[model samples]
Structures are given as structure tokens and as C-alpha cells.
Target: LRKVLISDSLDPCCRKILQDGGLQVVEKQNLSKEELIAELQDCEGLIVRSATKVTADVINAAEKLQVVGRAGTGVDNVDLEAATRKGILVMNTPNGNSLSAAELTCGMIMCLARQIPQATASMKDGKWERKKFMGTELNGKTLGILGLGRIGREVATRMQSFGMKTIGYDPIISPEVSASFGVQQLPLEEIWPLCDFITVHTPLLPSTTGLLNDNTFAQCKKGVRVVNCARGGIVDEGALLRALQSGQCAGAALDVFTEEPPRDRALVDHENVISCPHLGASTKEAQSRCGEEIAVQFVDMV
Candidate 1:
């Protein structure tokens, strides 16, 4: 019988699929680096969520490992290069959390526009600052979306219902495809100057890292609000802070940071910024869907 190691916590109901598929499922949550290397030697398949780091060493130590599965999207935690070199397939459940992530992004946008968090905090402090919390409406504002992938399109569709015009840039996706989502495909350069609000849904890649740095912020309209619901490091936190300080950016809603529990207190603590601890896929529906999808994929592969 083939053996699998589930190195992260998942929905127990989902793991039963693998159990019923005639494979042994070993549940080990929060394994230390040294322990993972030692245990990899015995498993042919490995399942992980965002917590586990499947580094080159883990792949190197696994003599019989054929697959590494991510319960959710974003395998940026895994060492894709090393896995490819070792001929170990790395797969993720891409669509499992699309709706959940999109909903969160839209929620962030609304929060930033209306200063919802700030207002809520203010009321809790026994101060009714109605004038101070005066909010902007989303209606008729231009929303610029970076990377028109699944999650990005979902955001565009939701925002459009509020009468926001959506313009996007994605070199890989066709203009006609974006148009179907009520998004006008524009050049990246054009997107910066026209948008009243901007949100990034791109992955963290060589070209995309710090895609919203100081120079790009300079190109955007003054008072443009920014949101990053995708991977972190794609937006430069330091640059974003500077922009906020200089009034180059009006507000920011960041769901992911370069560092989890980011060390930069200025950015996270800023009044103009609303931060989440990477809760993009925290919904119960998303959790169950991702867990089940990964289990089914792993069972089929193994």
C-alpha cells in the first residue's frame, strides 16, 4: 500500500476520502524542519496547507515521493523549482477558494472606501465621529485591477454591481476574455493614471514583486486607494507606507504581507490601512472545498 503524509491540519471529513481510497494517511501537524526531513524518507505522497515549507531538502530527502499537494491555491510556500528538478508533481486546488477570496477582496474595498474598521473602532471608543467617518461611495468610481485571473475577475464582477467601471491589465489573458467579465483590458501604463481605486490579484513573481513600488505609485492618480488580496511581496510595503505618508495613496487594504505577522508596524498600524492576517481563504466553504479537492487529487494521483 502507498503511504501519504499529511503534514498540515485539514478537515477530517475530507481526509477520509484518502483513507477510503486504499492509502494510508498520516496526520502530523506542525512538524519541525528536521522532523519533516526525517519523515519524508518513508512517504510516497505529501499533503500540505500554507504552514508546511516543502523545501529542496525535503524533496531531496524523499526517495519515493511522487506528489506534493496543496489544499489551497498559492504554492508559493513550496519550492516549485526543486520539486520540478526531483520530478515530484506539485498541484493545488485553484478554484476551491475563488469565491471566498473574491468576497474578502470586495469586503476590503468597501471597508477602505467607507472607513468601516475605523468607524467601528471609533464607536467602540465612545466617540460618535460621524463627520470624521464621512465615507466615499463606490458608485461610478473607476476600479483598476491588476492581473485578470480567476480571483481578479470575481472582484471585477462584484465591484461592477456597485456601478464601478472596471479596467484591467493582464498580458497573458486576452482582451475579449476580460471584456466578458465587464472589464476593459487596458495597458498597465494606462491603468495607473485613470483608476480611482486599484486592487492587485497577481501572484508573487520576479516581474510582479514590488509591482506597486514608489515609481508605480507616482504614476497613479493622487488619492488612489490600493488593495492586495493576492500574494504579498507583490506590493512593496515600504513603498506603500511612504506613499501613504506623502498622500500619494489615500488608503490601502492589505490581506497578505511579505511577512506573516509582518515586522513593519508602520504599514500594518497605519490609519489608512486595513490589514487581515491572510484570511483570503478562511471561509468554511472554502476550507471544505479545498480540503476535499486536494484529497481527491492526491487519491487519484497516488
Candidate 2:
């Protein structure tokens, strides 16, 4: 039997598919490096979500490993260099969870603008409040998008349906291409000055790390609200803290953090942040899509 090991929880459909294909699937959630190393030494295939870090050292230790699969788009969790050197195939399911994540971005923007999370919690505790949760409408406001890719384009489409004016900045995609979606392409510099509400949707790449830092905060429109449903390190957390403290940023929403399962309390309990622990790819639909896609790929690889 072809052996495949899963390092994080996936939809039941994935395991079912592998079993139907006559593969031996070993599943574990939140496994440590030593555990993963021990398990991977004899396996031909491995599947991972963002939780497990399959490093170069781990890859070198696995003599039988042939393929590595990431359920979601970003493969930053896996070591590409080692996989490449070992002739191990690494693949990701890009755009598989785009809609789920894009919808969450819209939800986060609305949550921050309307104070929905806090407001709903307050009402649940039996409090009638109006002024306590005053909200802003998105219509006619300039909506700045950082990256005009799959999830960003999805968000732009939804935001347009709401009658919000959308503009975006992407270093790669052309202006003519973005205009098709009613997104006026602009430079990163122009985004901060013009947009009332901004959302980021880019992978964590070398160029994008610390994309929003001290200097960028100074350029933003006064009282501008921010949302990051993308990678964690893209925005400097310390810079964000100062921006919130000094009124440079009115409110913020974050789905991902610099660390997985967040190593510190400052990230989770911050009042200004409408935080979700990397829930960008956590919806039922997204899970199903990732699981099915990854399972199919694993079968082919094995």
C-alpha cells in the first residue's frame, strides 16, 4: 500500500479518498518535529496544513519521502530548498479556498466598521446599545486592496456589488487587467493616501514582508481602517500597535499572525483587533475543496 501521512486535521473526505485508492493514510494533528520525523522516515507522501513545520532538516531525515502536499495555497510552511534537492515534489492548492477567505475579508471589514463582534457579544449579554456600536456604511468609500489576485479579485467583486469604489495595487498585474473588475490600479504609495478602508491579500514573499510599517502608517488617511487576511509578517505587529495607540489607525482586523497558534497574549486579547486565529482557510467549503484537491494530487503522486 502507498503510505501517506497527514500532519494536520483535514476533511474526512480526504482520508476516504485515500482509502478508496488503496493507500495507507496515517493522520495526526499538532505533531511535533520529533514525532513527524519518526513518522515520515518510512512514508512516501506527506500532507500538511499550516500547523506543522516540515523543515529541511526533517526532509533530510526522511529517506523514503517522495512528495509533500500543502492543502492551502501558501507553501511557506514547507521547506522548498530541501524538497527540491531531494527530488521530492511539493504542490499547493491555490485558489482552492479563495472564496471562503475572500468572504472572511469582507466579513472582517464589516466587523471592524460596525463593531459587529463586540456589539453582538454585548447584546448577547442582555444589553440594549445604540451609540455603543455606531457603524459606517461602505458605499461610495474608497476601498484599497493590496494585491489583486484570486482572493483580492473575489473581494473586489463583492465590494463592487455593495457600491464601494475599489482601487488596488499589485506590482505584477497590469492596470488594464485590474480595470476589468472595476478596480483602478494604483501604486502602493497612492493607496494609503486615498483609501478610507484598506484590505491586504497577498502571500508572504520577500518583497511583501513588513509591507505595512512605520513609514507606511504615516501616509494613511486619517482614521483609516485596516484589514489583513493575508500573511502575518506582511504587516509589522509592533508598528500596528503604535498606529492603534496613536490614532493613526482607527481599527484593525487580522486573520493571520506572525506565529502559528500565536505565541503571545498581545496578539489575541488586543481590543482594537477583530482577530481570528488564521481562519482564512477554515470554512467548511474551503476545507472540503482543499481536502478533495490534495487527496487527488496525493493519489496521482503516489
Candidate 3:
């Protein structure tokens, strides 16, 4: 690996490490797919965020490319099947936002319980509706984590400080491994009724998509709240809207949406929901960590 392309926006620390390690860094961003193809000329590696699309054409054109490193967790932006066939070692840094993302997850669950965002909205409206926003105590509440990765594991550890009990399901992680983290690994269906609040940290993949839908929600305890700090599509938006309307779900805190800046306003405008525009990786510390760690990852990959 010699000349590398940083094709999408990321912290300068990416270049900071890559260039420091005696690799040439072509740190250009916002390039059209056409320009991206041309930039692949003689490039050995490519670095990207979710912004750029690494099409089959780009990979085919990448004469010397050995690896494609994405700065974040999801690589759905890339044509994965194409990369694999080309024998290109494409990987993502899951640990990048794990620390930062967990913080937001804890906040989302806490905010949903206390109606902090709702209180702010009312205060901003100059309405003194004090008792109207009666908050719940998390001291003895149960928290269900759908995916027990680093983010979910860390969430369990943090919220545990507040006296919240943690249980979850992760087919990938063994039961013994999760047991060491104070998490009781249950079957997917078992998590339904037991959780007072649920947070899904799974990525957007075939089986994981719509992991929480009408059927799963119906299995939940009435007024069970949810928080999604991971990818969208894990929770079906259409089902969520109806559940919110029916009061089957008390609230939802979303850091990512099914469609960015979602063309449909139904979920965004729901009073029981609090939506933030993909802020999980927005913090500067998380971005810098994601950048630096991923730069190191490819170097290690080589």
C-alpha cells in the first residue's frame, strides 16, 4: 500500500496517522463518483465515511487497491459483493463510535423516561405545564439490549449504575462472554415481555432489519419505550408510527432514521418520539477516534 485516497470527510487525524506511517495520503473529499473512479488510478487503499459510494466500477478501476477501510460501523454504502469478488479486504471500525455512541444511548433511554426533551419543548413554548410531564424512575426498571456488541455492552455497564437490570440477545456473542459483562443472554423472544425499556444497537442487515416490528412490539410490556442509537431500518418506521398512535409504545428516541432527513414527516413530528439527525458519530472526539483508529486498522491490515 503506497498512495491512499481519503475520499470522504473525516477527522484530520486520519491523514495525521496515515501520512506519519510513511504512506502517501490523497485527502480529497466530496468527489463525484466519476472523479472517484479516476482517483482510484494506482491507488493502493481507499478510506471513506458513509458519504462516498465505492461502486463495482471504482473497485475494478482500483488497479493496485488491496483494502477499503470505512471510518464507521456500516459499510452498506459500498458494493460489498463486488469488493469480495475482487479479493479486496474491506473492513469497518466498529470500535470507533462505540464509546461515544453508548453515551447517547444512555442519554436517550434516560431522556425518554424523564421526558426531558418534552419538558424543554414545553418550556420553550412558555407553557408552565409542570405536573403534566410526570417522569418515571429508572432505579428498578429493566433495560433490554437487542444487540450485545461494545455499544450495547457499555450501555449495560453505564445504566447499571442507575440500578437498571440488563438482559439481551446476541446470536453472535456466546452466552458465557456476555455473562461476564453482567448481562443475561436470553433468546430473542424471551426479551419481549421482561424489558421496561428497549434499545437496539444492531446494524442494518437482512435479518436484523425490522428486528423490532409490530409482532415484537406486541410482545412487549404495554408502554415499553425504545431507543435506537444504531442504524435505521432496525425498527420499522411504519409500524412504529402506528404503535405510537395506538399508545402501544410509550416513546422512541432515535439518533438515526430509516431515511436521513426523512422525506416522510410522520415519525419526526410525533410528540412521543425524539429524533436527532444521526448524531451518534457527530461528536468531535468520536470522529477523531474513528478516523485515527481506522487509519491504524488498514495499516495493521497490511
Candidate 4:
């Protein structure tokens, strides 16, 4: 039987899928770097979530590793260059968590519009300051979406139901495809200064890294709200903090950060920013779907 090691937590369905396909599945979560490198020697396939960093050293140490499967979108955690050099196929379940992530993005947008977190906290603290929390309405506002992928498109479709006009920037997607979702395709220059709110749903690549720095933020409309439910490092945290301080950004709703549990608490502690602990794909349905999809892909490939 082909040996497969899952180095991160996955839904139970993954192990069952692999085992039913007659492959030997090893479940090892939160393994140290040394332990992971040692375990790679006998494995033909490896499955991982965000926690496991399949580094170049781990790829080099694997004698028989064939495939590296990510249970969700964003292969930023996996070293694609090293995997490519080692002739290992890297795959991800892109569509499995699309709806869950899109929903979280929309939820964040709503939370930012109305001071949901702040109001709730005040209520819990034995206070009712209703007049202090004024809010904006989504209706008749323009939303600029970065990266028109599966998740981005889902967000646009849902936001449209709230009477929001959607304009998007995505080099890979054609204008025709964007129009099908009622989103107007535009250049970044055109998108900025026109959108009332902006959201990013792109992967972390060299071109995308720090895409929302000071230069881009300067071009946006004053008091433009922002949402980032995608990967971290796309939006520069330092720049975001400065923008919030300057009131160039009215508010921000962040689900991901440049650092996990970000050491710099300025943004998290800001009155204008609302944050979550990367719960975009934390839904039970998304977990099961991603696990099942990655498991089947591994079985077929191996």
C-alpha cells in the first residue's frame, strides 16, 4: 500500500477516504520540523492545512513523496518552487471553501458598516449607548473587489442582493466573465477613488504581496472601508494602521493578518477596525468538503 502522512488536522472523512482506497494513512498533527522531516522518508503523499509549513528542507528530505495536497485555498504555506524542483505535484481544494469564505467576507462588511462588535461589547458591559453608534447602509454603495476568483465572485453575487454595485480588478478573468456576475471589470486605477468599500480575495504571490500599501491607499476615496478575508501579507499592516489613524480609511474588517495573532496589536485594538481569528473557512461544512475533496484528489493521483 502507498504510505500517506497527514501532518496537520483534517476532518475524519479524509482518513476514511484514503484508507478505503487501500492506502496506509498516518495522522500526525502539530509535528515539529524535525519530526515531519523524519516522517517524510516513508510517505508517498502528504496532506496539510495552514498549520503545516511544507518547507524546502522537508521536500528535500522526502525520498518517496509524490504529492502535497492542501485542504483549502492558498498554497502560500507550501513551497511550490521546491515541490516543483522535486517533481512533486501540489494541489488545493479551491472551490471546497468558497462559499464559507465569501460569507465571512460579507459578514465582515456588514459588521464594519454598523459597529456590531463595539455595540455588542457595550451592551454586555451594562450600557446602552445607541446614539453613539451611527452606521452606513450597504444599499446604493459601490464595492470594489480585488481578484475575481471563485470566492470573489461569490461575494459580488451576494453583495448585489443588497443593492451594491460591484466593480472588480482581476487580470486573469475576462471582462465577459466578470459581467456575467453583474460585476464591472475595471483597472485598479479606475477601481480606486470610485468604490465606497473595497475587499481583497487574492492569493499571496510576489505581485500581490503588499499590494495595498501606502501608494494604493492614497488613491482610494477618503473614508473608504476595507475588508480582507483572503491571505495575509496582501495588505501591509503598517500602512493599514497609518491609514486608520489618518482617517483615510473609515474602518477595516480583517479576517487574516500579516502575522497570525498579530504581535502588533495597534490594528486589532483600533476603534475603527474589527477582526476575527481567521475564521473564514472554519465552518463545519467547509471543513468536511475540503477534506473530502483533497482526499479524493490524493487517491486519484497516488
Who wins the TM-score comparison? 1
Model 2: CA > 4 A from native: 19-22, 27-32, 36-38
lDDT of 3 by residue, 1-302 (tens): 66788888867888878876768877688687676666777667888887767777677766777788887777757888888887876778777788888998899998899999999998999999889779898999998998898898999999889998899999989999988778888986788999889998897889888888899988989899999988889999999988898888999899888787689889888888997878887777888788888888766755
For model 4 the local lDDT of residue 118 reads 80
**How do all models score by TM-score?**
0.95, 0.91, 0.93, 0.94
Clashing pairs in 3: none
Instruction: State the lDDT of candidate 1 residue by residue for 1-302, as single tens digits.
Output: 27878788777756688887878766678678767756767667788887767777677766678787887767857878887876766778898888899999999999989999999998899898989767789998999999988899999999999999999899999988989899999887889999889988798889899999999888989989999999888889899889999888989999888888777788988888898888998976898888888878777854
Among residues 3 or more apart in sequence or in different chains, the pairs in candidate 4 whose N, CA or C atoms overlap within 3 Å are: none
Q: Assess the local accuracy of residue 282 in candidate 4 as a C-alpha lDDT between 0 and 100.
A: 90
Candidate 1 lands at a TM-score of: 0.95
Better of 1 and 3 by lDDT: 1
lDDT of each: 0.85, 0.82, 0.84, 0.86
Q: Pick the candidate with the highest lDDT.
A: 4
Better of 1 and 4 by TM-score: 1
In terms of lDDT, model 1 sits at 0.85
**Residues 270-295, candidate 2, lDDT per residue (tens digit)?**
66678987788887678878888888
**Poorest stretch of ten by lDDT in candidate 1:** 34-43
Off-target runs (Cα >4 Å) in candidate 1 are: 37-39
lDDT of 3 at 278: 83
